[PDB]
Amino acid sequence: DLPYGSALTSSGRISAVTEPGELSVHYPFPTMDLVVLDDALKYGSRAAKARFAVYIGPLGADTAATAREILANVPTPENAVLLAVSPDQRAIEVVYGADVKGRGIESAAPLGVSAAAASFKEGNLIDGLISAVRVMSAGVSPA
Amino acid sequence: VDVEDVPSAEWGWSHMPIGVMHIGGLLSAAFLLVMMRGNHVGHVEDWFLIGFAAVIVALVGRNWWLRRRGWIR
Amino acid sequence: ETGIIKRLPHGAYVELHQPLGPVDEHGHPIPLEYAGAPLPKRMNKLGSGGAPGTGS
Amino acid sequence: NRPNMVSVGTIVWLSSELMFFAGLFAMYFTARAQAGGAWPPEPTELNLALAVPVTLVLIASSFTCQMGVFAAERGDVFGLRRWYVITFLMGLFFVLGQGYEYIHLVEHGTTIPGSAYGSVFYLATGFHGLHVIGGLVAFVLLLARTKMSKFTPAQATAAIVVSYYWHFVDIVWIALFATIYFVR
Amino acid sequence: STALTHGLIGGVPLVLFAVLALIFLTRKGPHPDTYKMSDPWTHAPILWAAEEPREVVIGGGASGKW
Amino acid sequence: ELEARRPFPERMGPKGNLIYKLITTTDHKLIGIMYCVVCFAFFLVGGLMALFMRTELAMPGLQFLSNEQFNQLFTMHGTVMLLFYATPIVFGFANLVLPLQIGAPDVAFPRLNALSFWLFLFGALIAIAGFITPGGAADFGWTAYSPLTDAIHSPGAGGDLWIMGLAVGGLGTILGGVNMITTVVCMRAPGMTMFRMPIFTWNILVTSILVLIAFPILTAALFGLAADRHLGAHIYDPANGGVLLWQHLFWFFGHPEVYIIALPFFGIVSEIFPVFSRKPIFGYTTLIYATLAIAALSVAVWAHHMYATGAVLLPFFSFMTFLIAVPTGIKFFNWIGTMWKGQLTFETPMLFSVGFLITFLLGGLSGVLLASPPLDFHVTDSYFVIAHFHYVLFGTIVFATYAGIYFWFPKMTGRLLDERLGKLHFWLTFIGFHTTFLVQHWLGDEGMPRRYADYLPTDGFTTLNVISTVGAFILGVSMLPFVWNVFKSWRYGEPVTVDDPWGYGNSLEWATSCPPPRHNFTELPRIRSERPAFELHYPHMVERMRAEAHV
Amino acid sequence: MHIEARLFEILTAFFALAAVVYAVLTAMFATGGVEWAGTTALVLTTGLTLITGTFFRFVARRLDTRPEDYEDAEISDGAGELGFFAPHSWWPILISLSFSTAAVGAALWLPWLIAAGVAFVITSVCGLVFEYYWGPEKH
Ligand code: HEA
Ligand code: HEA
Ligand SMILES: CCCCCCCCCCCCCC(=O)O[C@H](COC(=O)CCCCCCCCCCC)COP(=O)(O)O
Ligand SMILES: CCCCCCCCCCCCC
Ligand SMILES: CCCCCCCCCCCCC
Ligand SMILES: [Ca+2]
Ligand SMILES: [Cu+2]
Ligand SMILES: [Mg+2]
Known part of the structure; x- marks a missing residue:
């Protein structure tokens, strides 16, 4: 089941390899744009004391229910905010943990969706996520 | 500053405004350049002052540009 | 950090650590809070070196 | 079992030290071949009435140093201290004995700038004397560490490797003593 | 001459740098092309999360569609 | 199966993540990293010294440099670029991968390993500090031939600082060599026998032995030289026979020293050829014997630099020098055999290694020409030598150094250097070096000696010097792409999420994460050959390698 | 560690042969007799490998087959504590600074600076040796 050149070590870790001249990450976005998104995610969560998550991919038939299961994979789900975007389904779903409730997220959740959507009509995916993270993180108080 | 940058942020003075250091850097280079007005006849020291002033100006400009573009905070 | 390196049966290299406080479920301890006081970093300062022996 | 990492490191470094004395020996032998018949030339007059008793003291220091090694392996820290203190005192006598011989040689006209023989003689023996002084510092540092903590096998290893340096120093002097005071 | 000597020393390295740079720096790197909204999402699902703060009941959420 | 990951790896640590680590580190990985930065700082500093010399030897006459300044220039250039750049980077790569190659968590003496770096750094600065003196460096x-280095002929403090700066740096090299021998003997992982280590580890252990034979004798010779200048001794007096005495000891140091900065870089390419050829290293057992023969032969050939003195036994050293050409030739045939019937992709680590084979051979051919005293009687102390040793020292301490850096950068960073920028740097370096050092073969043969600040227009050396000057500045501008690549790819490079970014790594460092943890290993695979990583990553090839090992 | 000692013995034999041959080849053919500076180095070069080789021989005959000396050894065979390795220390940089101070004094021939450097070296070396052995303060 492991990919070519990948092996299972004695401790359970996976020792993978890549062909020379190839990339191990190959995210379909520019490197500089990824840095800006990381800065928005790292600094936004820091100023809010709540972990911020961004998901890109399919959301099944019902987008609302899919994001609930996805948030479980985010570290510390109780204090995590997940932003799910499905380019094929053209839907935006925002889900947050129990600890985030009562912290001012209810007024920023539609703010992030509208801000992300406005940039999504322009063909900018990374820019929309960056804008959504900034406004959503700016409306969340520490702890 | 916050805890992750300076762990002892609440234990004492840990933040210095960037404007003071940026303006001080420009004044540092300005003081290096004005010292060329002297009684020395040689120009070897003059080129050393120019190089140090240029290095300081370049560092200040590099930091200001990075801060403006949001690469560093 | 005690400075003692131990090789696990699967080949993992780990360094023995001496917790300064209580420990959680497994080996790793619960992190303490800074109190503005110096924290020991040498195991010899904690008395691990013992005493040479009473006498001249 | 296990190879002693500290002992391996000390032995490997000790072999390198031998190449340092190889340069000093080369200078003495090169100058000796150019003597033309007088080696040592006037007014240098080496005496065996002082070099031999001082050389024997350094040789006897190896036996006392080895006795401390046996105590160190036995776990007797106090026995290690007793034998190393005696070794330090007799090792110190070697420096004082060599220094006393230097004073008389200088007063008789044998100096570093005075003669080419004085240069090869003083640097060869003087650099060895610096090694003896460095060995005496090692004895004091190791003895000071014995009163800081309990006698551990790591502590006993440090005693053994120090004796390796002392044995190397004593062996080097035997080569220097035979080359200078006998092969004239 | 003295003008030709100084021109070659200061000119050839700059000319060679420009010619060689255009050969390699204009090539396409291993980085994948930027995703476009018109194209379908053929990439694997991506989950991004920040490492801060250092270390399941859902309090609610919001929906949207563009 | 969704795992949370950052969009990009952290560019740099927070404030105060490095400064206290730099002066208190015992980790060989960080110490090895500090070597490369300082080694390249000295590489750039020493390279600027040659540019001033090269730009002065462009047109006949002293335009902007005096005779004394030019004389100081090549002395400091050679001292910095052999002892302050080439020798330390031998241990720079050794502190990087050698504990990883043998499956060790650290070096034998972590404290002594850190002492070598600081001792070297402060020793190198002392020698360079002679420039600020009014007399000069x-x-x-x-x-430093005698009695030129004498107080009567070299009375300034710049020469005195040069002697003591080498002694401090030499002590660090001896301690580093001591650490490497102990680490190889004692810190090997279970299942890693002596004849199962990578070739690079074999070369470093062999090189460390050469350090213990050469550097102590240099320290002894320098101390005797310091006695003459300060105590007025007659150690190197010409009437006493010290003219030959100093040269003999210095060359007993020197020729083992050039192989100290040759064998490890022979090992570096020996780790890169199998990876990018998808083939095992050819003649693995033979390469070890060749390395041992080279190390042994390099000790009794010290006097072939002394042919023109007319005071050495020519038949003995000429024959022994010719013997070194055989094991060195075996290494090329093993390296060519490694690439033979393979699958070459020619990445930047592979591209630099290929340039090594072309560059080194021409310098090696010139070495055999100089090995014969009759041919050396005309080209000794001339630019034919300078062309020979900048083909043999640039084939290794630069081409192999760059190949190892591009090879091991993702391992110690988690980021990949740009390949497009790497290819530009390699081609610029190749073209510049060849342009600036091919014509110097004709210059030395025409009758132009080395260490000459000025030449007459009627000498006929102007045309070739201008061509060499053009190529040298190409080497200078070739540093900008590499420096930019290292500066950018360190923080904004392509992330490495796999143990082996090159796919077909053989040594044990490719079996751990990039970058490796503090103790270099969270697991260890079974070691049954010289390629444990290849066996682990490709279990289905274990049977094929055993059956097809022998032709 | 049979192979480790065999490497130094192989070098020992070649160095001994070269030293003997070159000495006997310069005594009857080199101008001026034996090349001394040159021969002395070769003879004592053999001693460098002889001392290390002999010690490795004695060590090998005492200890049995190590896990790293076993052709087919398992990773779990080497499980256990390896030893003590220093995690961090700022003493080495002080020793280098202390040694460099004496070197500068020796280069410029400053007796006061040489004496300070020697005292600094002893003080810095003492800290390195006693770093992991100083006991708790007795107050
Ligand atoms: C590793 C060894 C090594 C390396 C890499 C080099 C590199 C170079 N060397 Fe050198 N050289 C020697 C080892 C080496 N040298 C030795 C041993 C001697 C004999 C010493 C003696 O005669 O006593 C010698 C002497 C020597 C000579 C003959 C001396 C004579 O005239 O008698 C010449 C010929 O011009 C030369 C030229 C060059 C050039 C053009 C480079 C090019 O590689 C250099 C170009 C590199 C650069 C890096 C350019 C700088 C770029 C910059 C951007 C500078 C900016 C820097 C800062 C701002 C800090 N060197
Ligand atoms: C990496 C550094 C390095 C290396 C590897 C070498 C390798 C060799 N060197 Fe050299 N050398 C220097 C660095 C180096 N050298 C320096 C720095 C100086 C002068 C410094 C100074 O004076 O300031 C110098 C000077 C020097 C001299 C002194 C000349 C003089 O000063 O007049 C001599 C004399 O013989 C010499 C010869 C050789 C030989 C025979 C080899 C051989 O090892 C090379 C052998 C390699 C091959 C032979 C190629 C592989 C073989 C084959 C492909 C088979 C071909 C077979 C045949 C031709 C029979 N070199
Ligand atoms: C200078 C000693 C003279 C006596 C000669 C006999 C040698 C025995 C010395 C025993 C010393 C005991 C000190 C001790 O254990 O205290 C230790 C602390 O003292 C030291 O560290 C002293 C270091 C001395 C450095 C200078 C050496 C100079 C050498 C010069 C050589 C020519 C133990 O302290 P503690 O028990 O922890 O309180
Ligand atoms: C990349 C290889 C460059 C080689 C340059 C050789 C130039 C030789 C010119 C000779 C001119 C004689 C008048
Ligand atoms: C190992 C021999 C190398 C020879 C290089 C020769 C370069 C060509 C120079 C041509 C000069 C024409 C005047
Ligand atoms: Ca000119
Ligand atoms: Cu040579
Ligand atoms: Mg010559």
Whole structure:
């Protein structure tokens, strides 16, 4: 089941390899744009004391229910905010943990969706996520 | 500053405004350049002052540009 | 950090650590809070070196 | 079992030290071949009435140093201290004995700038004397560490490797003593 | 001459740098092309999360569609 | 199966993540990293010294440099670029991968390993500090022949600082060599026998032995030289026979020293050829024997630099020098055999290694020409030598150094250097070096000696010097792409999420994460050959390698 | 560690042969007799490998087959504590600074600076040796 050149070590870790001249990450976005998104995610969560998550991919038939299961994979789900975007389904779903409730997220959740959507009509995916993270993180108080 | 940058942020003075250091850097280079007005006849020291002033100006400009573009905070 | 390196049966290299406080479920301890006081970093300062022996 | 990492490191470094004395020996032998018949030339007059008793003291220091090694392996820290203190005192006598011989040689006209023989003689023996002084510092540092903590096998290893340096120093002097005071 | 000597020393390295740079720096790197909204999402699902703060009941959420 | 990951790896640590680590580190990985930065700082500093010399030897006459300044220039250039750049980076790569190659968590003496770095750094700075003195730095050449280095002929403090700066740096090299021998003997992982280590580890252990034979004798010779200048001793007096005495000891140091900065870089390419050829290293057992023969032969050939003195036994050293050409030739045939019937992709680590084979051979051919005293009687102390040793020292301490850096950068960073920028740097370096050092073969043969600040227009050396000057500046501008690549790819490079970014790594460092943890290993695979990583990553090839090992 | 000692013995034999041959080849053919500076180095070069080789021989005959000396050894065979390795220390940089101070004094021939450097070296070396052995303060 492991990919070519990948092996299972004695401790359970996976020792993978890549062909020379190839990339191990190959995210379909520019490197500089990824840095800006990381800065928005790292600094936004820091100023809010709540972990911020961004998901890109399919959301099944019902987008609302899919994001609930996805948030479980985010570290510390109780204090995590997940932003799910499905380019094929053209839907935006925002889900947050129990600890985030009562912290001012209810007024920023539609703010992030509208801000992300406005940039999504322009063909900018990374820019929309960056804008959504900034406004959503700016409306969340520490702890 | 916050805890992750300076762990002892609440234990004492840990933040210095960037404007003071940026303006001080420009004044540092300005003081290096004005010292060329002297009684020395040689120009070897003059080129050393120019190089140090240029290095300081370049560092200040590099930091200001990075801060403006949001690469560093 | 005690400075003692131990090789696990699967080949993992780990360094023995001496917790300064209580420990959680497994080996790793619960992190303490800074109190503005110096924290020991040498195991010899904690008395691990013992005493040479009473006498001249 | 296990190879002693500290002992391996000390032995490997000790072999390198031998190449340092190889340069000093080369200078003495090169100058000796150019003597033309007088080696040592006037007014240098080496005496065996002082070099031999001082050389024997350094040789006897190896036996006392080895006795401390046996105590160190036995776990007797106090026995290690007793034998190393005696070794330090007799090792110190070697420096004082060599220094006393230097004073008389200088007063008789044998100096570093005075003669080419004085240069090869003083640097060869003087650099060895610096090694003896460095060995005496090692004895004091190791003895000071014995009163800081309990006698551990790591502590006993440090005693053994120090004796390796002392044995190397004593062996080097035997080569220097035979080359200078006998092969004239 | 003295003008030709100084021109070659200061000119050839700059000319060679420009010619060689255009050969390699204009090539396409291993980085994948930027995703476009018109194209379908053929990439694997991506989950991004920040490492801060250092270390399941859902309090609610919001929906949207563009 | 969704795992949370950052969009990009952290560019740099927070404030105060490095400064206290730099002066208190015992980790060989960080110490090895500090070597490369300082080694390249000295590489750039020493390279600027040659540019001033090269730009002065462009047109006949002293335009902007005096005789004394030019004399100081090549002395300091050679001293910095052989002892302050080439020798330390031998241990720079050794502190990087050698504990990883043998499956060790650290070096034998972590404290002593850190002492070598600081001792070297402060020793190198002392020698360079002679420039700020009014008299200037050393102006007698890196071979510091006697009695030129004498107080009467070299009375300035720049020469004195040069002598003591080498002694401090030499002590660090001896301690580093001591650490490497102990680490190889004692810190090997279970299942890693002596004949199962990578070739690079074999070369470093062999090189460390050469350090213990050469550097202590240099320290002894320098101390005797310091006695003459300060105590007025007659150690190197010409009437006493010290003219030959100093040269013999210095060359007993020197020729083992050039192989100290040759064998490890032979090992570096020996780790890169199998990876990018998808083939095992050819003649693995033979390469070890060749390395041992080279190390042994390099000790009794010290006097072939002394042919023109007319005071050495020519038949003995000429024959022994010719013997070194055989094991060195075996290494090329093993390296060519490694690439034979393979699958070459020619990445930047592979591209630099290929340039090594072309560059080194021409310098090696010139070495055999100089090995014969009759041919050396005309080209000794001339630019034919300078062309020979900048083909043999640039084939290794630069081409192999760059190949190892591009090879091991993702391992110690988690980021990949740009390949497009790497290819530009390699081609610029190749073209510049060839342009600036091919014509110097004709210059030395025409009758132009080395260490000459000025030449007459009627000498006929102007045309070739201008061509060499053009190529040298190409080497200078070739540093910008590499420096930019290292500066950018360190923080904004392509992330490495796999143990082996090159796919077909053989040594044990490719079995751990990039970058490796503090103790270099969270697991260890079974070691049954010289390629444990290849066996682990490709279990289905274990049977094929055993059956097809022998032709 | 049979192979480790065999490497130094192989070098020992070649160095001994070269030293003997070159000495006997310069005594009857080199101008001026034996090349001394040159021969002395070769003879004592053999001693460098002889001392290390002999010690490795004695060590090998005492200890049995190590896990790293076993052709087919398992990773779990080497499980256990390896030893003590220093995690961090700022003493080495002080020793280098202390040694460099004496070197500068020796280069410029400053007796006061040489004496300070020697005292600094002893003080810095003492800290390195006693770093992991100083006991708790007795107050
Ligand atoms: C590793 C060894 C090594 C390396 C890499 C080099 C590199 C170079 N060397 Fe050198 N050289 C020697 C080892 C080496 N050298 C030795 C041993 C001697 C004999 C010493 C003696 O005679 O006593 C010698 C002497 C020597 C000579 C003959 C001396 C004579 O005239 O008698 C010449 C010929 O011009 C030369 C030229 C060059 C050039 C053009 C480079 C090019 O590689 C250099 C170009 C590199 C650069 C890096 C350019 C700088 C770029 C910059 C951007 C500078 C900016 C820097 C800062 C701002 C800090 N060197
Ligand atoms: C990496 C550094 C390095 C290396 C590897 C070498 C390798 C060799 N060197 Fe050299 N050398 C220097 C660095 C180096 N050298 C320096 C720095 C100086 C002068 C410094 C100074 O004076 O300031 C110098 C000077 C020097 C001299 C002194 C000349 C003089 O000063 O007049 C001599 C004399 O013989 C010499 C010869 C050789 C030989 C025979 C080899 C051989 O090892 C090379 C052998 C390699 C091959 C032979 C190629 C592989 C073989 C084959 C492909 C088979 C071909 C077979 C045949 C031709 C029979 N070199
Ligand atoms: C200078 C000693 C003279 C006596 C000669 C006999 C040698 C025995 C010395 C025993 C010393 C005991 C000190 C001790 O254990 O205290 C230790 C602390 O003292 C030291 O560290 C002293 C270091 C001395 C450095 C200088 C050496 C100079 C050498 C010069 C050589 C020519 C133990 O302290 P503690 O028990 O922890 O309180
Ligand atoms: C990349 C290889 C460059 C080689 C340059 C050789 C130039 C030789 C010119 C000779 C001119 C004689 C008048
Ligand atoms: C190992 C021999 C190398 C020879 C290089 C020769 C370069 C060509 C120079 C041509 C000069 C024409 C005047
Ligand atoms: Ca000119
Ligand atoms: Cu040679
Ligand atoms: Mg010559």
